[PDB]
Symmetry: C4
Subunit: 219 residues, 4 copies
């Protein structure tokens, strides 16, 4: 029976049928957003919803008999498994995020289309050539986050009171978002020289980030 | 008479007479902005306006009897057609944006001049080699916009209350506009972990957006 | 006496004497900033100022004998004339900006030192290849600035009340400064659809500005 | 004994032992952040800290005999000296930044891993090409900061008023952070024309900053 189902699975119709469900399920989830619609046709939806999840487990079952180990060595295949997996966990217990993480299956539209796969892969492929710099910054954030936590966290515990909080605030300064009136101008009402910590922080981080951009505009 | 007018239409005079009118009506529209100027000379500029609107229809009419099918296959011409059409809809009824969309005619200075046309066309032509990315992002915004609506909509309806709202807020974070003090920090007073949703959303959206830019400098 | 002075002006010493004065007057103008310093050594620095302005007029006078009509055809040369001239206008009457515009002479340190000159020129040379785009946008701003004034200026005169105000506000959106909480979210409390004007406004203007930068990396 | 130690120091084990310390002292510093952790293991960590500081001075001493003059002509080595030196100052009176600057030793993880060194060096190497621009800008900032102080600092001393305050505010405008609502809109309530000073300032400073980025993407 193997070669029977291998022909079914590898069949263009099969793929296109899967893709069709995604674009239907995608549209369905955006409708699940309307509190009105759910009162009207929620039943219709949750069942259509459960159907797809059944169908998707079947597909993932089929997809593995026809690839075995070649499957679990495929990023795209793995993705799909782990996504449908999520959607499998019952509609209760644990963390209310699971019910919500279900919408991640809409990313299957990416996986089930090569043109998308192509673009994502083009994108991802740039990452390893960034890890040298990324690592550098992460070391950097970590060093300053620590300095900040012990320089400002006592008078300013919202922003710097904790290693995590300093990390967040330092990130915010890096995105340059409301950084002066929002953070440093205040900080300075107590610590006049805080500009000595943040202007340099800003130069370094902005400089590095520009280098990172030109680095990707060469490869 | 065909060749008589085909020789009038193609005439440098005719074309430069059009450009001359555009720059006048352009100037006249910035004057119509002034409450003071409209008092005293309202009728001047209202007549002068209706005058030009005729002249432009006459032209667009003449322009067709010379080009027929060729004219309804010229981007720049179709434009000119539709932009005059809008300017034709009676100063009443329906929507009042039509009185305001009439200012779109000043975009004719772009069509009716090659130097401008060159640059516009240059710009536009970059778009198709972005749609792969643009598609990806729209799918992404749609996914996260759904998650946000069903994670923050209840306590924060102004910002995430509706699928559209989340789209708006998500756009806003993407432009990095006032995103932390103002959206995420407030959010965190209730949802300590909201940072888990927004830092990743930001990395992705900004990474992708950098790629899209380096894409446009490899062409 | 011509050849005598053509050896005074063209000399190394002359030039390096001029440069020495600039860096001295420059330092002197940062000290004129302190109200303290002025209550002590203010007389010193006002004379020192008039002194330098004398010395500078002598030089520019000299410079013209040695160069005649060739001088008024050098960008850098014309500049120094204009800048020194501004510095000549009596410490009274008309506008006080003239007293303030005097500090523009410190731009002579650029005019009168190569490499600066080189770099400035490097930069300016990039401009003409932007004029097509620049022009394009200025038409675009103008069109929307008009549109906004008549869509939003009645309920929101601070921001869109005058054509000029719209230009300012529209500029501000383009710099993406506080555009959503500061301007559009408010606007929407009255004009729910205002998002239809600003998101498109923002795509266009951002897109364009990206191209203009990609252009400057082609040239 | 020279060649004995030159075989100890130059040894892989020596280096990898140093790296192993950094990553441990690094971890230990992120824990010294916790107020809880200090109340339980504070003594453990302060001793461990004093220890590592010795180990690093022993190393730095060893490192010097094996290299002599070649060491004080190595950037990376000098660094390690100064960084360790800072950590050497007696945890006591004087400034308190010295206790905080101690966390700078984690930058040794950069100095003592060739993969970091490379990337850092790759970055630093870009700086010389920028000094022509960097100089230009500093001159520019200096000129406008002075103008601003004498134009706006009487009514707006928080922001201007001091040559330094202007510098800061001008920096802020350049990062474009809250520049319109936060600064220029207010200024205009008193000085209607302040826009004539800040819009050009913004064009120029952002122009320059674009050219600088393009110059780095070509070298
Ligand atoms: Ca802001
Ligand atoms: Ca901002």
């Amino acid at each position: 029976m193997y070669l029977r189902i291998t022909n079914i699975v590898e069949s263009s119709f099969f793929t296109k049928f899967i893709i069709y469900l995604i674009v239907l399920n995608g549209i369905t989830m955006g409708l699940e957003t309307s509190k009105t619609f759910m009162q009207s046709f929620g039943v219709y939806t949750t069942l259509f919803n459960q159907i797809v999840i059944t169908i998707f487990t079947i597909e993932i079952i089929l997809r593995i008999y026809v690839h075995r180990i070649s499957f679990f060595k495929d990023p795209w295949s793995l993705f799909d498994f782990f996504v449908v997996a999520i959607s499998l966990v019952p509609t209760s217990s644990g963390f209310e995020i699971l019910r919500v993480l279900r919408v991640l299956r809409l990313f299957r539209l990416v996986t089930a289309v090569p043109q998308m796969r192509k673009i994502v892969s083009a994108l991802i492929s740039v990452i390893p050539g960034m890890l040298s710099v990324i690592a550098l910054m992460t070391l950097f954030f970590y060093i300053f986050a620590i300095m900040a936590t012990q320089l400002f966290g006592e008078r300013f515990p919202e922003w710097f009171g904790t290693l995590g909080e300093s990390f967040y605030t330092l990130f915010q300064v890096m995105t340059l978002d409301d950084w002066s009136n929002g953070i440093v101008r205040p900080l300075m009402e107590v610590y006049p020289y805080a500009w000595v910590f943040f202007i340099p922080f800003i130069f370094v981080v902005t400089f590095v980030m520009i280098n990172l951009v030109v680095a990707i505009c060469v490869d």
